[PDB]
A paper describes a structure:
Henipaviruses, a genus within the Paramyxoviridae family, include the highly virulent Nipah and Hendra viruses that cause reoccurring outbreaks of deadly disease. Recent discoveries of several new Paramyxoviridae species, including the zoonotic Langya virus, have revealed much higher antigenic diversity than currently characterized and prompted the reorganization of these viruses into the Henipavirus and Parahenipavirus genera. Here, to explore the limits of structural and antigenic variation in both genera, collectively referred to here as HNVs, we constructed an expanded, antigenically diverse panel of HNV fusion and attachment glycoproteins from 56 unique HNV strains that better reflects global HNV diversity. We expressed and purified the fusion protein ectodomains and the attachment protein head domains and characterized their biochemical, biophysical and structural properties.
Cryo-electron microscopy structures of diverse fusion proteins elucidated molecular determinants of differential pre-fusion state metastability and higher order contacts.
Residue numbers in the entry:
A (entry chain E): 367 to 415
B (entry chain B), C (entry chain A), D (entry chain C): 22 to 477
E (entry chain D): 121 to 169
The structure:
Amino acid sequence: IPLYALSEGVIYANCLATSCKCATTNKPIVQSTSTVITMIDNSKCPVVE
Amino acid sequence: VDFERLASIGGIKGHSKLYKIKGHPTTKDIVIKLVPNLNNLTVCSEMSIDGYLNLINAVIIPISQSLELMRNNVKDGTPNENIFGAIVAGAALGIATAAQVTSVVALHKSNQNAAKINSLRDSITKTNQAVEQLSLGVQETVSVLMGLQDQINTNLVPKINILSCKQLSNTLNIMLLQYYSQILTVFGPNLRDPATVPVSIQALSQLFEGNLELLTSSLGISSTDFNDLLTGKLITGSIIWADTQGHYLILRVNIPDLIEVPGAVIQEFIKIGYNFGGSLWMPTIPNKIIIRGYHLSLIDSTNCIITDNSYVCDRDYSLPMNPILRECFEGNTSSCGREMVLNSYIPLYALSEGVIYANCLATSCKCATTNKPIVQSTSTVITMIDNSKCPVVEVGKQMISVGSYLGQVSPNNLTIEIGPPVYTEPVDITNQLGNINETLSKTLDLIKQSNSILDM
Amino acid sequence: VDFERLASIGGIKGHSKLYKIKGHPTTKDIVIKLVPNLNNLTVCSEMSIDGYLNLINAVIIPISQSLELMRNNVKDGTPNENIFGAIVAGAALGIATAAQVTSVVALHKSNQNAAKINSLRDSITKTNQAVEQLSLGVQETVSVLMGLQDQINTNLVPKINILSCKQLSNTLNIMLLQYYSQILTVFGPNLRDPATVPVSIQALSQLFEGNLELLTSSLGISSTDFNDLLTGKLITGSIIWADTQGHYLILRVNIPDLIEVPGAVIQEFIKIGYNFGGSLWMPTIPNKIIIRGYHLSLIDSTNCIITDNSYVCDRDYSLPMNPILRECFEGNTSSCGREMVLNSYIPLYALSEGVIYANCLATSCKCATTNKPIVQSTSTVITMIDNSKCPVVEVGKQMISVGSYLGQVSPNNLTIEIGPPVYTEPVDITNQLGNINETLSKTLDLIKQSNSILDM
Amino acid sequence: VDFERLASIGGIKGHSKLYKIKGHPTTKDIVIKLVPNLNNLTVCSEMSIDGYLNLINAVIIPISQSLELMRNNVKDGTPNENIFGAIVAGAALGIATAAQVTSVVALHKSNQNAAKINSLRDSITKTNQAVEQLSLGVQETVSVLMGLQDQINTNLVPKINILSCKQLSNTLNIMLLQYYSQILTVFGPNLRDPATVPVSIQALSQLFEGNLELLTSSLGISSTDFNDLLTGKLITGSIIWADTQGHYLILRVNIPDLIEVPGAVIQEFIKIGYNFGGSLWMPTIPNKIIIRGYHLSLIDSTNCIITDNSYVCDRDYSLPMNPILRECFEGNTSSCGREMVLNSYIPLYALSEGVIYANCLATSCKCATTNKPIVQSTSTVITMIDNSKCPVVEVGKQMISVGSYLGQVSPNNLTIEIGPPVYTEPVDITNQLGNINETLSKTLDLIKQSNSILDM
Amino acid sequence: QVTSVVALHKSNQNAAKINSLRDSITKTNQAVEQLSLGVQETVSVLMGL
Ligand SMILES: *[C@@H]1O[C@H](CO[C@@H]2O[C@@H](C)[C@@H](O)[C@@H](O)[C@@H]2O)[C@@H](O[C@@H]2O[C@H](CO)[C@@H](O[C@@H]3O[C@H](CO)[C@@H](O)[C@H](O)[C@@H]3O)[C@H](O)[C@H]2NC(C)=O)[C@H](O)[C@H]1NC(C)=O
Ligand SMILES: *[C@@H]1O[C@H](CO[C@@H]2O[C@@H](C)[C@@H](O)[C@@H](O)[C@@H]2O)[C@@H](O[C@@H]2O[C@H](CO)[C@@H](O[C@@H]3O[C@H](CO)[C@@H](O)[C@H](O)[C@@H]3O)[C@H](O)[C@H]2NC(C)=O)[C@H](O)[C@H]1NC(C)=O
Ligand SMILES: *[C@@H]1O[C@H](CO[C@@H]2O[C@@H](C)[C@@H](O)[C@@H](O)[C@@H]2O)[C@@H](O[C@@H]2O[C@H](CO)[C@@H](O[C@@H]3O[C@H](CO)[C@@H](O)[C@H](O)[C@@H]3O)[C@H](O)[C@H]2NC(C)=O)[C@H](O)[C@H]1NC(C)=O
Ligand SMILES: *[C@@H]1O[C@H](CO)[C@@H](O)[C@H](O)[C@H]1NC(C)=O
Ligand SMILES: *[C@@H]1O[C@H](CO)[C@@H](O)[C@H](O)[C@H]1NC(C)=O
Ligand SMILES: *[C@@H]1O[C@H](CO)[C@@H](O)[C@H](O)[C@H]1NC(C)=O
Ligand SMILES: *[C@@H]1O[C@H](CO)[C@@H](O)[C@H](O)[C@H]1NC(C)=O
Ligand SMILES: *[C@@H]1O[C@H](CO)[C@@H](O)[C@H](O)[C@H]1NC(C)=O
Ligand SMILES: *[C@@H]1O[C@H](CO)[C@@H](O)[C@H](O)[C@H]1NC(C)=O
Ligand SMILES: *[C@@H]1O[C@H](CO)[C@@H](O)[C@H](O)[C@H]1NC(C)=O
Ligand SMILES: *[C@@H]1O[C@H](CO)[C@@H](O)[C@H](O)[C@H]1NC(C)=O
Ligand SMILES: *[C@@H]1O[C@H](CO)[C@@H](O)[C@H](O)[C@H]1NC(C)=O
Ligand SMILES: *[C@@H]1O[C@H](CO)[C@@H](O)[C@H](O)[C@H]1NC(C)=O
Ligand SMILES: *[C@@H]1O[C@H](CO)[C@@H](O)[C@H](O)[C@H]1NC(C)=O
Ligand SMILES: *[C@@H]1O[C@H](CO)[C@@H](O)[C@H](O)[C@H]1NC(C)=O
């Protein structure tokens, strides 16, 4: 089952089961309680793990 | 020592090695000649030797004068009913320490063998080889030696007629100035008082192009095990004669032996950084712990070579441990302390007997047999991992397997006692001037302001 | 940071350099042969090789045993949907750190290429000349050199019949013992655990008479610019094989690259003495301040070489400071400490952007065109001098011209907050401890009383 | 300073030596050429010199560019009608210190003699000997020198036709890379700024096989007395020209002179362990005290050589001391601190002008004249022993004679005022001001509860 | 698709190594051949017709 995908530089990622990080800051990314699918763009970090 | 609570605060028990100290040195006598013996160079040598001799006389003569003047300060003879003891005229010493007295006693013991070797002065000056032996007695021999005899027995010797004699004289002059610089380098502190200063075998080996085990094999001591291989930088020696006629030095060196102090175990440790309060803290605990019969002390390996199985020191370096630091290594690990580590080269996980101690909040933890991540417990910061959770472990980027068990009780479940932060600056001493002066005459204000109304 | 207040307290802003860290190392393999290949000396060399072989076999075998035990600790396995690699046994490793696991994974990675190099053992042993690079085709390569092969290809070879063969045997014995001392010297710590300890490249060059540029050119690194000419002491790398048959060691080294941390600037400072209260004080500030986007950190350039324009560290060495240091650097000259000096080698004037910061209380200050003295103002301690006062300046004996402009405000008209004198003593700590003890035992007695006299 | 009270607390007055500082240096100009003028090797040398030239040009050109850039900012012709001197362009320097300005003035002074030597460039480049002299003027001379010119005039020359030309070219290549590595080693910090950095004579000496004495003899300094033999490691010198045509470096060195500071006597001290409280302690005093007209201060001989009669420093190192330490040295043994030792290498007895200071509690003390033991007095700790008690004394194992007397004041009957047991502060005592200060900030909360006491 | 991107970025060096023997590829006159990629490595060039 895929849990992340890319759409025009937009990452939809289920970070509850997938590791999510920003190595500009070297921190993990956690799951919000208001949503399950995780929105990721360059506003959080431009280079993503 | 409790390794569970000390692992919970962040210190991991490393290897345990032995402690062995050099003891009982026996003596052996070497001789070092200084004037190079040219015998094939009688055709073209000029008198370039005279400049070298005038350079080295200023080293040879006052060393020998100080040696015989220290020799005059000790005499033998009976003090009345007492038999002997090498009675030392204390008015002839000025200011002297215990080691100088011991060295003077050593040269008084070695006067007889120094005279015995000095009887073979013409035997010393007739050598034309690099290193060879001469029979001192029926079962004793001497170890006369030169590193630079070979260089004017294999290099300047074949160019006796191919090259011009003035160029051999110039090259011999350059080599003699270089070698006189070498003796001026090695006998630097030895010119001050050449009777109490010990002599390193390494700086002696620098006179012979850095060949340590040539000198060791000519001495006769032979290493055969792993421990005596890295051992070899701690052989000491003493000047016993400084003869000006043949321009040589008779030296007495000591053959070492690594005796073992019983019950002493050198314990190593691993320090990791743990994230508490949003900050990465490092514990303030030392590395090497000497333990001997329930006694914790400090040592320094500033000069001690470390083997795979033991600690080898030239001399015992037992320093007292702080009793606060002893109680740190006891169950009161809140008295240990911690400091900031923001640098990236801080380890977060380590292995010990199939046991993984991992700070899992910053390091990824999962088990591929179960394909689930591992979460930090709220009651601890250091994370225990063994085969009970998963025998096959992923930590960070690396894939491992584990074994064994916890050990007495698990260090993850008990409560934690967090110490104070530690700073190292004299600015903190001025701040302790300031905040005690914020408090001291405010504590005097407690003393005043309480008693003002406690009367009624 | 406020440079005007820092100039008032006595610090002058020095240069600004960059910061670069070694990063992204690719791997290149070499081999190091130990047995010298004598081919011309097959007429008379005796069996002088035998003692050298017996000496090196004591230090060849256990490294090989340790490395194959390191390969035995790892096992290429895959439980379920694993990464199909790594996997070490926790019981078979004992106690280890993260870097030891990394070294084990590096051995498990490069075992294939180690077998690839070991396939050409007869090609390794037939190298008549010393330095050659071979390859495994178009991609992958290996290198080999011997610092002693030339000495038995241009020095010991031509005296094959002019000199006696026993003298060649003795000279080769002396040379082999010297070189065995050199390998014994460089692999000092390498005998303990020859998998997790890197190899200093300068100590490797010491085996070959200190020629770092020969191995630099033969390795493939060809530095051209200013910054990489001094750099080259940061090669590093670990051994991968210790083959006994051909008597060679297969080594893997890392080709470095200097990456740049963004936004980080190293700042230097100049500390001068100021005469306050009839006393000469120096400011107590660190010399180097690294800034990266409003973030002051501390660094130590103990192993870091400094070029004309940047800082070259092998790895990042960030250290923290107290927030009182941040107050000292930003706004609070009262929080900045001071120290007492009386020595003569204290500078009192300096130059910055054509602006003279000079203590005129001890140094003569005049303007030569007007021929008038410059007097210390009572409001300031450090004197600012620009071309507004005089473009032609005479300081002490020196004759200077100034220019440019001031910059925001002058430091002389701002008030100066002199901090407490930083001067510590263990006696001060001890009697402070006694003072604190007696005062809190007074206060705890009165607090027990005042808590018992709450309710009247 | 009171030696009797300081002997009562356990410190013995050592030797008294003088203090000498290097001062008033004159300057001598030398030249160092780089390209080896091979003349006998015009048949088989190939163009192996070209790689050496391209390697050294990237070093030589930027040094010359920075050298001409630093001398381009200084100008003569003072606009003041009476004063005349050298003016630097302070706007063009940017940031500079006092020593940099003084160095620029020095090169401005030496530019004329640099051009005078540069007029003899073809004389410099035509030398085929190792070290020789040329006619600079009617009485001035230069000291052009090469260490490697001997090696291609006594070693590489005679194998001109016996050995193959490519082998000579490869040997020349290896030697050129090794020597180019040596110039890269010595001119490390000089590449950043070759104007304000002096050059050590020993760093120059490793370019010529570590021959400091050859450079000392060719320079003109001829040390004859015992004090100047050890001196010579502190010779300073700076470059004045960096010529790229002949690829040579014109250097200016400073001939030193050891002046003597008046009235300053350096004093040594011997710290003996004393058994108080069943415990072995040591006094906390510095080893060396400089006294100059009743002025106790501190020095550090970290770079200063120590002779038998004097202390020789390259530059004055007067350090201040605490007034509590001055009271400790003068009158207040209660102000003197003590530290704990338990290690075996603590001497408990020493000699001073025939005066035995011996702690008899641990060391066996006897009188051989009477065959009785000597008991420790309860009023003192360190045992005074002179000829008044017994002339022939047994201490430890040793027979020792004694001499002199008490001098002025007897320490054997004097009262004891051993001060506080002061403690070292490695990392821990900061948390003893960090766990006790929070008890103080519990009492700061008790100030708020004392306000409640006042209110209720 | 991201995994395929990583696969081509992982194998472009070996693709260049195989492309280095383009003239060796076109000279085959039999059905199936094995040509040496490296020291102990090979590929399979093949033409059933
Ligand atoms: C080292 O010791 C020798 C031996 O002297 C003995 O030891 C000394 C420490 C003293 O205790 C001496 O009394 C004792 O004998 C010293 O050699 C001696 O030197 C002295 C001069 O210092 C010589 O005396 C001279 O001898 C002749 C007699 O014709 C004349 O030149 C002079 O008038 C003068 O008296 C003496 O002969 C000599 N030998 C002996 C056996 O005493 C030596 O000086 C001493 N110290 C040093 C630093 O070398
Ligand atoms: C390093 O590993 C090799 C390979 O062995 C493999 O790895 C080990 C860690 C274990 O997991 C093994 O089960 C596994 O096969 C070891 O070499 C092996 O050594 C053993 C002895 O220790 C050999 O057994 C001997 O074989 C013959 C049988 O005729 C007789 O001489 C003896 O009776 C004895 O049984 C074995 O053949 C050998 N090879 C293999 C493939 O197993 C190696 O010992 C090990 N460790 C070290 C320190 O070298
Ligand atoms: C070192 O100083 C020299 C000398 O110049 C003098 O000092 C300078 C600091 C300035 O104050 C100058 O005004 C003063 O004369 C400098 O060399 C000079 O450089 C300039 C270029 O900057 C040269 O001009 C060139 O000349 C020819 C004309 O045909 C052409 O190549 C160019 O079009 C250009 O105009 C000039 O000739 C030269 N010499 C003199 C005597 O002025 C030098 O720049 C300075 N700095 C360094 C780093 O070397
Ligand atoms: C060189 O000296 C040795 C040793 O004394 C001697 O055997 C040999 O004959 C000498 N050679 C010549 C050519 O004189
Ligand atoms: C230290 O531990 C002991 C038991 O070993 C306990 O009695 C004591 O209260 C502890 N002290 C602390 C935590 O300060
Ligand atoms: C730790 O305590 C928990 C309960 O808090 C218990 O389940 C566990 O077995 C303990 N671990 C031991 C005793 O090793
Ligand atoms: C507080 O400052 C005074 C001087 O004002 C000083 O004497 C005292 O020792 C200081 N208090 C401390 C250091 O606790
Ligand atoms: C010395 O060895 C070289 C290299 O193998 C060879 O060319 C030469 O002929 C040999 N010379 C002798 C005398 O054996
Ligand atoms: C420190 O500086 C700030 C402004 O940056 C100022 O408000 C404050 O009063 C200063 N504190 C002192 C001098 O203690
Ligand atoms: C410094 O302040 C004084 C008044 O105190 C004023 O005359 C002078 O111009 C000021 N200098 C500046 C702002 O550079
Ligand atoms: C202060 O220090 C000692 C330890 O040095 C402690 O035992 C004592 O109770 C304290 N108080 C006094 C008055 O000495
Ligand atoms: C070697 O050079 C010297 C000095 O230039 C010269 O006198 C001599 O003739 C030369 N010899 C040969 C064989 O070229
Ligand atoms: C220090 O010694 C002086 C006399 O030299 C004396 O007056 C003073 O009381 C002493 N102070 C002490 C012992 O604290
Ligand atoms: C030391 O004092 C005692 C009395 O306390 C006295 O008998 C003795 O002579 C004194 N020693 C001297 C002054 O040298
Ligand atoms: C002083 O106490 C406070 C509050 O307990 C604490 O934060 C601080 O670190 C202490 N000071 C030192 C120097 O440890």
